[PDB]
């Protein structure tokens, strides 16, 4: 246990028997956020559970030596699962021929991409990602249909456009079930 100077960090770290090979480590910050890490026979990270201030966790399990592993993000009402690589993390939601990918870079840059394998020029879905607004805009038949704003509060919000795609209408609703995300990609 090593507490930082500003009395804000509680680094619950445990050594195996001597002080060379790490085993487990938990660091709790002031803003209710923790980063649990587990290690292997070598000393490279095996699991990495990171908790944000709002309670949404980003859990990494089964980290291999090459830098890969299993990825899953737990949220209020639904979870997003995927894979981590030494490049970036991808979280995948699939509905029919449409696959939605959420990308989290090693620098924290969140990216969202969409792909539809249908070859029809009408029903195929395409998306454009806005970095500043953090909204994925789904386009169908060269007209905008839905807006997918990914809030900094770790939630997915959908706002629908009009019949011509000129502007969004009504109010933007929040997603509380995984089936809702699948319904948006149909």
């Amino acid at each position, epitope marked *: 246990l090593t507490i930082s100077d500003d009395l804000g960090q509680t680094t619950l770290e445990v050594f195996k028997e001597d002080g060379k090979t790490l085993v487990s480590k938990k660091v709790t910050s002031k803003d209710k956020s923790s980063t649990e890490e587990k290690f292997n026979e070598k000393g490279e990270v095996s699991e990495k559970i990171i908790t944000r201030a709002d309670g949404t966790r980003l859990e990494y399990t089964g980290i291999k030596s090459d830098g890969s592993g299993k990825a899953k993000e737990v949220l*209020k*009402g*639904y*979870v997003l699962e995927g894979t981590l690589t030494a490049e970036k993390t991808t979280l995948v939601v699939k509905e029919g021929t449409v696959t939605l990918s959420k990308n989290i870079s090693k620098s924290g840059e969140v990216s969202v991409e969409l792909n539809d394998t249908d070859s029809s020029a009408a029903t195929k879905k395409t998306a454009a990602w806005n970095s500043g607004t953090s909204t994925l805009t789904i386009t169908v038949n060269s007209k905008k249909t839905k807006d997918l704003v990914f809030t900094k509060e770790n939630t997915i919000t959908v706002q629908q456009y009009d019949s011509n795609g000129t502007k969004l209408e009504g109010s933007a609703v929040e997603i*509380t*079930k*995984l*089936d*809702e995300i*699948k319904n948006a990609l149909k």
Partner: antibody
Amino acid sequence: EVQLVESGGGLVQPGGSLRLSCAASGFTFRNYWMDWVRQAPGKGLEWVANIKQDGSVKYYVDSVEGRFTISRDNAKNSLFLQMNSLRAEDTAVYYCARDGYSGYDSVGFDIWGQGTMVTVSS
Amino acid sequence: EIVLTQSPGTLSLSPGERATLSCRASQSVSSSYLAWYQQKPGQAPRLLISDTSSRATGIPDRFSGSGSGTDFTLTISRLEPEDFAVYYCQQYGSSPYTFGQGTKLEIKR
């Protein structure tokens, strides 16, 4: 204490209609999804309908579509299932059930009620 | 639509034995969207396990869920006379939320 009370079932003729009611107490009704589950005599469980917290989103099985409607009243802490154009195969004990998956922890159907036995026959 | 198959049909065990209940899925079900339920006759079903690991606030340690992907298992370590109900495997990821056909745990005498 968390519990659910079901009412509205009975014996009706084929092609008739009846309304189910589920009274909720002991928990925040506005914060949970809700579901309808039926079970035919001597058969397994079959999910029927699902509703969002605010009632905007409703999902149904292929069989009951266009005939059953699920609604709720957050203020009255109640929930309903209108069942029009009843067929004989709809004879089952309909269990009102709380979703449970209302937060970060993933939970299955937390709460089940006693159920109401609806019988569709001539 | 995901279809869940439960094996065996009925399992005849004596109290105090260990019961292994397996549930097969037609596709790959995420480990975060599977549940186990118990229904004693004449009563409503009760939620036993969620997330394949969580015991749902009041179930003893005898009941234990495991498995991933296609095959999921629920094991009762030391059977008790009140444990010989019908058990159901359910997924709640994508609609329709389907249940298994059910396994009747019967006391073997």
